[PDB]
Design a protein around this ligand. Structure first.
Ligand code: F56
Ligand code: F56
Lengths: 451, 451
């Protein structure tokens, strides 16, 4: 890399994107409040976008240079997360009006944060194009901040990472590695570094048991788990892993009228997306029960689906025998990646025992660390755009993989890992398709039992 | 901003830098191990560099877009610091040979980190051009990683931030703000959220008292403070705030043979830099004593200065009367920024009482949040390059300011703040010069007592 070659590559990638936007009369992205929140899902546009992010980030890194690399990173980067901590806990996104400016004086008063401290936080936020200072003394939204107005799912993602993952798990991972070594046991995690025998706490135990708090409609026991469920929905409502990508990566219409057991769990929000598009499907969403789960599940269903039976909750232990009969599809989105081999095999064997090999299939959605195949229309540099050692999808896969490590001692898998896993569960399993849309990190994989 | 206009601005800034490098037969930066670690200090080159970093970072942000902004940031960014935590605690910089590759198998064995976990950490490191994977199975250095080989000052900066500042202070700042409000009391910090009356601990108390550890030649009591001293020296040895910038921002030669009391403290490493360049100066470096400080101070002096008396340590309480007579300069680099007004005024009044107004001066070096003046040669867009709401020097100033907030409830100052402060200490104080070299965040300010 040289600064000139990176600049040349940037110009080539921008030209691809800008030419497409102009050809199709599409809005240009900006930092204004009503900027489009994403670029077109056209595969060549997304290929250019992923390369552009990587090339621009590399150019900034090269221009910073090696002398200021650690000096500046270890100074500044952690405060981007602390700024978000403040913005979420003082509800600054909602306090700044979407379409107007507000003085620091008035904003400080609205949120109860002393103005001098408020100014110091905002100074750092602006450097990430998070809010702006349109004139001295005043604050306004940017594209990035306005998208999070009135969005508890976004606030959940900030707070889960800054109040739970980073302090309890990531900061402690060196010490956990020194204490237990490299294991897949979710007890071998930061909160248990000094725990007595049998008094260890699992992440999911803390989530479902703590009652000292409240989050978005759930008060007391399990408020942290409900917030976690909110985070999962956040990754479905928009951005790279948006749930509608599944409709491009798998043809749900070929199933006709069919019963789908959705072992994705959570609140069935992906089942709802597919159900709205395919009225002949019934989704039975299976998850470990919580006192509040059936009520919240039902309250959050799209209005069109409430009371219809098309998407319904069924409490279920995923490690137990499957009670539903005549299942056409077992669907598991971003669920098996939390399961080390033995646990994943238990789940898959219960599914296989409930499958009619001639009629049934498993559809999973998970990271394939070395890349799924693009949709046939999009088919065809050593790596696919986004992958490779500085790729932005490599980087997102690594962030998710390290979250699995830090919180659970779980791990992401390559395509061969997935195939080996399924074949160990049942040697009749065959991978029929592994489709990753450009811009996403996850693949939709279709599995059948071939006799 | 549009993607096209940002790309155009990048090309203009790269052209400035590349033209200068080629004109002067200078090495091109790259990610290779022996890349130059910085660009020329020519003011127009540095102006282009600061703008290039900002424009490239803005383009990456815009191409990520608002939908993936929080989704990806709250996933990934904290793991850049966790990766550094591993790299420092397992000494991976030193274990990878500077000029050769090493297999993951061999690297894992050298450092005692299981290979599967080692691979997952390195995957994230490469995305920041920290190390690389030159062929499958193998690890090598990059420019950014090789500069930290055998550098305890760099490792100190990683570990101070990831093991002390972030967990003990930054992560707790929302709760500290809720508990005490906006104060300047260094007791009103994270470690004391649940402390009983009179049992509060100051950051500097923890640093100088904890004896459960060892760092770079200091075992037991005060090892964390010695590590902190190492971090301070790290910012002097290279990069933006390098100590030799002071020789461009102030003319130490005009003093002739002179006695300088250096209330910068620490280990006098800036006094040493100036002393080497100006043999007629004597520096009396004043700092709070520690058992190990005189020995370490003397051991780290440049060989040419050892035993010469040109740079010597004098234990001193900066809040107490000044014992040295006939002082020509009181020098304070990056010291007063840790001092709220009343404390800073105490220090400045002790200096003023020891000054002969006709002979003496104070030279300080600190952030001026709204920008010092460039050296006269470099004199002469709303903001100076690097400043403004997305400037990279604005961002560095904010990182330092928020570190002062989180650890100390201290704060950075504008030029008017500094002038007001000095005049409150002694109304005879006049600011004679405030010089900031392009690429640095700190200004060298010269103060005299005018009758
Ligand atoms: C394949 C991508 C799935 C999207 C998820 C938001 C990824 C995220 C790391 C996740 O799975 C988490 C989890 O399971 C448990 C706790 N904390 C999490 O963040
Ligand atoms: C003006 C710039 C000075 C360079 C310093 C490395 C800045 C840094 C924030 C600092 O002062 C620190 C400190 O005083 C106390 C603890 N932890 C620090 O990091």
């Amino acid at each position: 890399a040289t600064i000139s070659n990176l600049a040349s590559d940037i110009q080539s990638q921008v030209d691809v994107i800008d030419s497409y936007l102009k050809k199709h009369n599409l809005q240009q992205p900006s930092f204004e409040v009503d900027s489009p929140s994403e670029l077109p899902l056209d595969a060549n546009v997304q290929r250019a976008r992923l390369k552009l992010i990587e090339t621009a980030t590399s150019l900034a890194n090269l221009a910073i240079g090696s002398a200021d690399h650690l000096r500046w990173h270890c100074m500044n980067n952690k405060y981007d997360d602390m700024v978000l901590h403040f913005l979420a806990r003082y509800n600054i996104f909602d306090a700044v009006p979407r379409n107007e400016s507000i003085s620091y004086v008035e904003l400080s008063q609205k949120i109860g944060l002393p103005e001098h401290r408020l100014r110091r936080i905002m100074s750092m936020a602006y450097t990430r194009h998070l809010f702006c200072e349109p004139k001295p003394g005043f604050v306004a939204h940017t594209s990035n901040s306005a998208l999070a107005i009135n969005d508890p799912l976004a606030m959940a993602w900030i707070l889960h990472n800054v109040e739970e993952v980073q302090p309890w798990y990531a900061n402690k991972l060196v010490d956990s590695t020194k204490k237990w070594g490299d294991t897949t046991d979710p007890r071998h995690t930061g909160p248990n570094l000094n725990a007595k025998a049998g008094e260890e706490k699992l992440f999911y135990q803390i989530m479902e048991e703590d009652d000292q708090g409240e989050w978005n409609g759930v008060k007391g026991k399990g408020f942290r788990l409900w917030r976690l469920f909110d985070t999962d929905k956040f990754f479905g409502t928009g951005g790279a892993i948006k749930g509608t990508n599944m409709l491009r990566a798998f043809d749900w219409g070929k199933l006709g009228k069919a019963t789908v057991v959705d072992l994705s769990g959570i609140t069935g929000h992906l089942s709802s997306t597919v159900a709205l598009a395919y009225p002949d499907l019934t989704f039975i969403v299976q998850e470990r029960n919580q006192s509040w789960l059936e009520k919240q599940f039902n309250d959050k269903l799209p209005a069109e689906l409430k009371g219809s039976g098309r998407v319904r909750f069924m409490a279920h232990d995923k490690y137990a025998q499957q009670p539903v009969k005549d299942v056409d599809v077992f669907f598991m989105s971003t669920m098996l990646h939390k399961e080390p081999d033995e646990k994943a095999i238990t789940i898959l064997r219960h599914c296989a025992e409930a499958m009619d090999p001639k009629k049934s299939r498993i559809v999973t959605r998970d990271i394939v660390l070395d890349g799924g195949d693009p949709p046939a229309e999009d088919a065809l540099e050593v790596y696919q755009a986004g992958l490779g050692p500085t790729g932005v999808i490599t980087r997102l896969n690594a962030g998710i993989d390290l979250q699995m490590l830090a919180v659970l001692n779980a791990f992401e898998r390559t395509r061969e890992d997935w195939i080996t896993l399924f074949k160990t569960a049942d040697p009749r399993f065959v991978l029929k398709a592994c489709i990753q849309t450009v811009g996403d990190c996850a693949s939709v994989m279709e599995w059948v039992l071939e006799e």
